[PDB]
Design a protein around this ligand. Structure first.
Ligand SMILES: [Zn+2]
Lengths: 42, 765, 146, 49, 50, 228, 110, 164
DNA sequence: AAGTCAAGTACTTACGCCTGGTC
DNA sequence: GAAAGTACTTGACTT
RNA sequence: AGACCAGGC
């Protein structure tokens, strides 16, 4: 989906949250996301 | 007759060719060699230091060729003739000056001869330089001899001009199936090394090398190249928009999932996966083994002390290949002269001479080590007399190498065969024809027709006629009448000047940028990245044409691929022409009348900014006219003498344009097989095989080229009448008919001279 | 020859800035490439057609090319009237430089005479960039048989 | 130490190998005695054969 | 078949040069005209071309 | 055409360059069956008709969203409505990816759900994403391209490039009685022996009867016989 | 259209840079940075000329004693967040003057 | 027509200029926003300036990951390499005249983690040498300096002003 | 755990004949 | 460095 | 004997 984190600005990968929730966080640095993710390519 | 504009243009070539002779190559390079190269090579190692004894050191202050004291030269250096008759070589002694120091605490000097060395004909150190008439009659030899050849051990051989692929430059090729490949080669001093970038699959790209074992994930390499932030990377090799994102995003994705950052895993990865360690002084082992690696591995050309320079360069190297991965075309094929560079013998002799000198060192160092390990009486000398009998290894070593054609190097370790060729003497053309000829190396391909057929870029820089029809076709070419081979100037005094012209250092520049205009490349290296290309180009060319850095260092714009190139790297062909300012020529009549009458000679027009040399890929950017009549004032340059397109050997044929190319090609091969009177000294000369003519005559129809090359002074053939009719019947297909009593008064009467050699030896008995 | 020039020049000005019906010759710029090849072809042969037709009787090349001796009517036509369309590789004189045959021609070389075309015979002589083009085809055919 | 790489050293399967060495060049490629060679030149007067 | 017209012109330019006692120049892309050789011939009693 | 083609024959190699196949359909007509069998047999129109491909993540569910535009299937003739690409979608699923689930709602939207080295789901879906607009909806896995050309005087027919043969001959809509195919070795794998020998002497005669002269009919038949 | 496009920007740039020069005039902290050739000769040697609008709205820099040096404009910006810091003697630390505004280079000419 | 005077200031401790490619401009009409809390480290002849920026607990902090791995709730860390190039000056406009103070050396700012090199070790654990490594082996050894950043300005002008 | 159809790496030949000089 | 083909040690997929 | 290079058709 090619997203990025403020500050460090590397990449955002989807990680499985415990018990039912699906989240995403930047690797090696603390962060979390509200989801509602979307992408479209033609 | 008044002076017109369509006349004096032809008078320009004799003024140009009278200063610089028909053969520049061998002469000019050998002259630069014996002065610049000799003083530089000896400066590389000026000292020999061995371990034993309290202190010993030896320094070579100066090295010269056959010149010292009040003596202008050797008392008598054997002439070319006598040297050829006695089978002796042609050489001049090498004078060296060294400073010896013993444990007797001394500092002293001397002048010694380390050995001999071959000297080429028509050189500054020869006896034939600037000599006229009776001087030649006394020295028993011909004034019209071309010169520029080495005579050793009886007969004489010639070092042939060898073509080489582009050195220290990026070249990108595309392929069916697997993908796109770019190759990078260079040499720094002792070693030569090649880098190969490759995309195997997925769009994710790999780096192959003989140093590192297997195919690194470059996105990790770039982390080891000093950059961390990711998307800065993407915004560099890809940048703003369109489809360049998703392709490189694949590698970007899976590279940072398993192992991600610029420091920790970056260096350690490469270091653990790296090949043989060379076994000595090896263990610093840490992230620091990759430090030395990351500095010098493949891209070592840039190097220095930072990670920023090399990084962006590799990134920009990734920039181009992902563009041609998108769609076909958009590449650089390796065919035409623009990507090719030729190297004169001047560099090759230096490579061969420095190897034998290096071999002498360690042997000479170990020579004194004998008595050094011996208990008593420390020795002052025998680093003189004993190394003199140990000398001459350079003599025979260099003489065997030049006579054989097999060069043995312990540094680059490149063994090259088929370099030197024996000069074939039949007619006067064959001697001048074999010289000024371009050879080629490697590339194989007897099957491939790619590097065979002629290409439009060859025009004016090479002969489009001459070619040795046979097994080898198009693999050997010839230079035109007016050409100049580029030397090397310097590096440092460009950048600093370029910075003054408004360009800025790449370090301070934030790199998000494919976006602002072009950028300035120095020998392929991105430096300035400056806006406003117009004022940059024009003013730079003005500083060239007028007061500074003439000839090479030419600048050309690149429209599609966004950049502006400045190349100072020499070893390439240059051609002269005339600048047209505004709507009309810069020459303008009376200036040329001032020339032909009494004065002004040549090379003065360069000072006045009239005639100059285009070159490289800059010849593509410019616009060249044909005739002064044809001018439409959109034109940057006109051309002087359009008939110079053909070579010197092909200038014999009358009305060449009336015929077809296959006919002119055959004559170039047969024309050198004709039998002439050769030289004046011919009767006093003993050859191995020679054919003579009795009553030679000039052609009834001459050419403008044959006068400048001095042909009709020594013509080959018999001028005779003829009739076109069907007669005989012994004629028919491709067979002529002669006439007796025309032949009985003689016609084309020949003579055949051969020789025989015997030697009376003495055994051990 | 002149009437066959501006017609193609009218076709080539519609290339980039205009639209035209394309044959099933796939993509663009190949369309007119087949048209410029077809037009200049016929014009060449047409010029050489009236040449030999009006040529005088008892001449050697006609009679010699007439029966058994040497060559054909096509050969003598190139000597006298006009030559045309030197073509190797199956196409027209691929660019050595960027988007141009020779530096002597403007950028984006399209129009006839800029690529692989000569309106001059062997008798009248050859314009300077009418030569290199002929040298190509000569070199190509020579290395072929070899 | 120094160096190797002398090619011709193979003594048996090479001389017997095809083309120049034995089977093709020498064996079925033999030489003809009582022969001659020279250039060419026309003539009307000699009948064919 | 061999198709060279450059040789056939050489005779006229050569013959005209001998009659004038001068070596006749020739070159690619230019040089001595063929037409002037015809009038140099025809005035001395020779057919204009060859 | 020329001598390297004879090399391809004489060598009798498995593969070969641009092996065109000739076939007759029914009759001479411009519409319908002419373009019908044209759009039947080749490649994948999946990446074409796909409209936009959407990737959505909401709550605990993973969604692959591909909505097909009906406009292309109407103009370009392919026989199905929705479910037959859905079974073609599950073909792709069965082949290189997974057997899990499939969804159908409206405007031909197909949803794909996945669930179980950490965070593999993101890396999983990332690869499944790019690989989706590829897989074949209809036709065979052979043909590089086809062409509809004017046959003989006024008639019409098509020529196809591929190794397919029998399968495109088995394909309904075309009469397979009189046909032809190159690279004889494969013709031996279907008709075999005699018919292949008749074909190899047919091509040898053809290509050598164009460039010039004559080889005569006798010498050719013996060459093909001693091989077969 | 080489000369065309560039002279169009030169006009504009010689105006726009004048505004942002006088837009920061009084003394809130606002900074710009310069790039100049080396060796810096000017006129006198006891032990400089300046910028201004040329006639008819043009812009010309200069130095004294028969020399004319004019250049303006800069490469693309909007990325950099920049401030110069004060370091002295390795003693104390880091005095910050605040932010940055513009960028300009000056090329010599005929 | 008119005249804009310019001056060239003196030494004044010289200067060092900061830049970082991480945070762009706010795109609003007001470009200026600034980092806080300083905490820089320093070394001679190659400085490699370190930059520390606070981390907010209020927004998307992800505490469960932190407590499991690092104490890295603590202030963010950035570093960078300095470089020098001649002929570069800085400018500020006062009244109707222009004043100019030379910049000297320049540096780039991009981050890195000691939460990494230390974590990589604790995970794993349980004669010439010139050029590159010489700038490394010496680097790690010779760098410890505590710089306290304090921002105030009065005499920064008048010092150079009276030099006219 | 046999029987299985499809994959990576490793091999021998690609021009008829002659006539000259050189180590 | 040739390119073209042919021959020889291992994995999914079943039963 | 085994080698080379040029070149001939
Ligand atoms: Zn982040």
């Amino acid at each position: 989906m090619l997203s990025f984190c403020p500050s460090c600005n590397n990449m955002l990968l989807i990680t499985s949250g415990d018990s039912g929730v699906y989240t995403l966080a930047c690797r090696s640095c603390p962060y979390e996301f509200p989801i509602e993710g979307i992408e479209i390519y033609d | 007759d008044e002076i017109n504009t369509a006349q004096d243009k032809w008078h320009l070539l004799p003024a140009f060719l009278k200063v610089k002779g028909l053969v520049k190559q061998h002469l000019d390079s050998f002259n630069y060699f014996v002065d610049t190269d000799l003083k530089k090579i000896i400066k590389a190692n000026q000292l020999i230091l061995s371990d034993v004894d309290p202190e010993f050191y030896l320094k070579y202050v100066d090295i010269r060729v056959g010149k010292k004291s009040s003596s202008s030269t050797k008392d008598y250096l054997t002439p070319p003739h006598e040297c050829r008759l006695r089978d002796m070589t042609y050489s001049a002694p090498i004078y060296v000056d060294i400073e010896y120091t013993r444990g007797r605490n001394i500092i002293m000097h001397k002048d010694v001869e380390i050995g001999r060395m071959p000297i080429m004909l028509r050189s500054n150190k020869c006896i034939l330089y600037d000599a006229d008439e009776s001087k030649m009659a006394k020295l028993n030899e011909c004034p019209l001899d071309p010169g520029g050849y080495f005579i050793v051990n009886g007969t004489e051989k010639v070092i042939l001009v060898q073509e080489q692929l582009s050195k220290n430059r990026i070249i990108v090729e595309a392929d069916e199936k697997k993908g796109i490949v770019q190759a990078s080669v260079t040499s720094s001093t002792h070693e030569r090394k090649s880098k190969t970038y490759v995309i195997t699959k997925n769009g994710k790209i790999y780096l192959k090398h003989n140093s590192i074992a297997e195919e690194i994930p470059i996105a990790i390499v770039l982390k080891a190249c000093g950059i961390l932030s990711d998307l800065e990377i993407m915004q560099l090799v890809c940048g703003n928009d369109s489809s360049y994102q998703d392709i490189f995003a694949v590698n970007l994705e899976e590279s940072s999932k398993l192992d991600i950052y610029t420091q920790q895993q970056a260096l350690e990865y490469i270091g653990a996966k790296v090949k043989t360690m060379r076994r000595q002084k090896l263990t610093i082992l840490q992230e620091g083994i990759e430090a030395i690696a990351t500095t010098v591995i493949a891209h070592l050309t840039v190097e220095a002390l930072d990670f920023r320079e090399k990084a962006l360069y590799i990134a920009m190297m990734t920039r181009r290949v992902v563009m041609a991965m998108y769609n076909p075309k958009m590449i650089d094929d390796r065919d035409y002269v623009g990507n090719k560079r030729l190297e004169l013998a001047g560099q090759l002799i230096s490579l061969l001479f420095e190897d034998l000198f290096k071999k002498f060192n360690n042997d000479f160092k170990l020579s004194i080590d004998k008595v050094l390990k011996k208990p008593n009486r420390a020795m002052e000398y025998d680093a003189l007399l004993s190394i003199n009998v140990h000398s001459n290894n350079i003599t025979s070593g260099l003489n065997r190498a030049i006579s054989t054609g097999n060069w043995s190097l312990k540094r680059f370790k490149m063994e090259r065969a088929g370099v030197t060729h024996v000069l074939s003497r039949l007619s006067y053309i064959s001697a001048l024809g074999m010289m000024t000829r371009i050879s080629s190396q490697f590339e194989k391909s007897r099957k491939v027709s790619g590097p065979r057929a002629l290409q439009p870029s060859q025009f004016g820089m090479l002969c489009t006629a001459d070619t040795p029809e046979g097994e080898a076709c198009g693999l050997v070419k010839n230079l035109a009448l007016m050409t100049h081979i580029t030397t090397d100037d310097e590096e440092e005094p460009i950048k600093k000047l370029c910075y003054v012209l408004g360009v800025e250092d790449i370090t301070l520049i934030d790199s998000a940028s494919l976006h602002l205009n072009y950028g300035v490349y120095l020998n392929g290296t991105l430096i300035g990245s400056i806006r406003f290309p117009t004022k940059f180009v024009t003013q730079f060319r003005h500083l060239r044409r007028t007061g500074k850095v003439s000839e090479f260092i030419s600048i050309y714009s690149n429209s599609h691929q966004m950049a502006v190139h400045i190349a100072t790297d020499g070893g390439r062909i240059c051609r002269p022409l005339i600048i047209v300012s505004d709507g009309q020529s810069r020459v303008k009549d009376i200036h040329l009348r001032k020339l032909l009458d009494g004065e002004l000679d040549f090379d003065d027009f360069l000072k006045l900014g009239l005639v100059e040399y285009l070159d490289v890929n800059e010849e593509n950017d410019s616009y060249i006219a044909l005739y002064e009549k044809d001018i439409v004032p959109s034109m940057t340059h006109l051309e002087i003498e359009p008939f110079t397109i053909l070579g010197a050997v092909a200038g014999l044929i009358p009305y060449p344009h009336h015929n077809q190319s296959p006919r002119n090609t055959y004559q170039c091969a047969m024309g050198k097989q004709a039998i002439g009177a050769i030289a004046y000294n011919q009767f006093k000369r003993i050859d191995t095989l020679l054919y003579l003519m009795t009553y030679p005559q000039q052609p009834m129809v001459k050419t403008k080229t044959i006068e400048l090359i001095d042909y009709d002074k020594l013509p080959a053939g018999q001028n005779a009448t003829v009739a076109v009719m069907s007669y005989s019947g012994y004629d028919i297909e491709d067979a002529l008919v002669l006439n007796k009593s025309s032949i009985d008064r003689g016609f084309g009467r020949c003579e055949t001279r051969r020789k025989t050699t015997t030697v009376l030896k003495r055994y051990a008995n | 020859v002149e009437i066959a020039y501006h017609k193609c020049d009218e076709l080539i000005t519609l290339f980039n800035k205009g639209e035209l019906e394309t044959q099933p010759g796939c993509n663009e710029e190949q369309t007119l490439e087949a048209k410029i090849g077809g037009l200049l072809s016929k014009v060449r042969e047409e010029v050489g057609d009236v040449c030999i037709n009006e040529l005088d009787n008892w001449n050697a090349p006609l009679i010699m090319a007439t029966c058994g001796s040497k060559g054909s009517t096509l050969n003598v036509s190139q000597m006298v009237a006009v030559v045309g369309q030197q073509i190797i590789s199956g196409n027209r004189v691929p660019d050595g430089f960027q988007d141009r045959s020779l530096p002597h021609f403007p950028k984006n070389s399209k129009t006839p005479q800029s690529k692989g075309f000569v309106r001059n015979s062997f008798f009248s002589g050859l314009s300077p960039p009418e030569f290199l083009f002929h040298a190509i085809s000569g070199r190509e055919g020579l290395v072929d048989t070899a | 130490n120094g160096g190797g790489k002398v090619k011709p050293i193979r003594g048996f399967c090479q001389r017997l190998k095809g083309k120049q060495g034995r089977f093709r060049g020498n064996l079925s490629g033999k030489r003809v005695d009582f022969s001659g060679r020279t250039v060419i030149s026309p003539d009307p007067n000699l009948s064919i054969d | 078949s061999r198709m060279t017209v450059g040789k056939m012109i050489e005779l006229i330019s050569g013959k005209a040069g001998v009659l004038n006692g001068t070596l006749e120049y020739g070159t690619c892309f230019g040089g001595s005209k063929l037409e002037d050789m015809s009038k140099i011939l025809v005035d001395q009693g020779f057919n204009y071309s060859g | 055409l020329g001598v390297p083609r004879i090399k391809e024959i004489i060598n009798a190699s498995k593969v070969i360059s641009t092996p065109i196949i000739n076939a007759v359909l029914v009759n001479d007509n411009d519409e319908r069956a002419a373009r019908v069998v044209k759009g039947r047999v080749e490649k994948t129109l999946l990446s074409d008709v796909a409209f936009y491909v959407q990737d959505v993540y909401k709550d605990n569910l993973s969604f692959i969203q591909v909505r097909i535009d009906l406009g292309t299937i109407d103009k370009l003739q392919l026989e199905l409505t929705i479910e037959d690409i859905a079974v073609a979608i599950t073909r792709a699923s069965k082949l290189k990816i997974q057997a899990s689930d499939v969804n159908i709602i409206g405007k031909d939207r197909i949803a794909i759900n996945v669930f179980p080295s950490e965070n593999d789901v993101f890396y999983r879906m990332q690869q499944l994403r790019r690989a989706l607009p590829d897989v074949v909806v209809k036709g065979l896995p052979d043909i590089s391209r086809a062409v509809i050309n004017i046959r003989d005087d006024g008639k019409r027919e098509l020529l196809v490039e591929g190794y397919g043969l029998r399968d495109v001959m088995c394909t309904d809509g075309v009469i397979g009685s009189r046909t032809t195919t190159n690279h004889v070795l494969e013709v031996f794998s279907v008709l075999g022996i005699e018919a292949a020998r008749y074909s190899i002497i047919r091509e040898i005669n053809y290509t050598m009867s164009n460039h010039g002269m004559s080889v005569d009919p006798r010498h050719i038949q013996l060459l093909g016989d001693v091989m077969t | 259209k080489e000369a065309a496009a560039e002279l169009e920007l030169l006009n504009a740039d010689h105006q726009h840079i004048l505004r942002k020069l006088k837009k920061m005039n009084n003394k809130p902290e606002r900074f710009m940075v310069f790039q100049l050739p080396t060796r810096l000769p000017a006129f006198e040697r006891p032990a400089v000329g300046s910028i201004r609008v040329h006639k008819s709205g043009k812009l010309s820099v200069k130095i004294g004693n028969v020399v004319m040096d004019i250049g303006k404009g800069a490469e693309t910006t909007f990325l950099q967040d920049v401030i110069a810091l004060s370091i002295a003697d390795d003693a104390s630390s880091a005095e910050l003057l605040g932010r940055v505004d513009g960028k300009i280079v000056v090329t010599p000419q005929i | 027509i008119e005249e804009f005077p310019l001056k060239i200031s003196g030494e004044e401790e010289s200067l060092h200029v900061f830049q970082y490619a991480n945070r762009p401009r706010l795109v609003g009409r007001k470009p200026a926003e600034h980092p806080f809390i300083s905490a820089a480290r320093y070394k001679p002849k190659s400085h490699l300036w370190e930059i520390d920026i606070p981390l907010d607990e209020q927004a998307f902090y992800n505490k469960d990951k932190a407590e499991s791995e690092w104490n890295g709730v603590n202030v963010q860390t950035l570093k960078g390499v300095g470089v020098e190039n001649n002929g570069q000056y800085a400018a500020f406009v006062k009244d109707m005249q222009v004043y100019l103070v030379p910049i000297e050396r320049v540096a780039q700012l991009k981050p890195f983690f000691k939460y990494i090199d230390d974590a990589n070790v604790t995970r794993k654990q349980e004669n010439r040498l010139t050029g590159s490594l010489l700038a490394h082996k010496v680097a790690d050894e010779e760098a410890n300096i505590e710089l306290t950043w304090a921002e105030g300005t009065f005499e920064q002008f008048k010092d150079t002003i009276v030099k006219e």
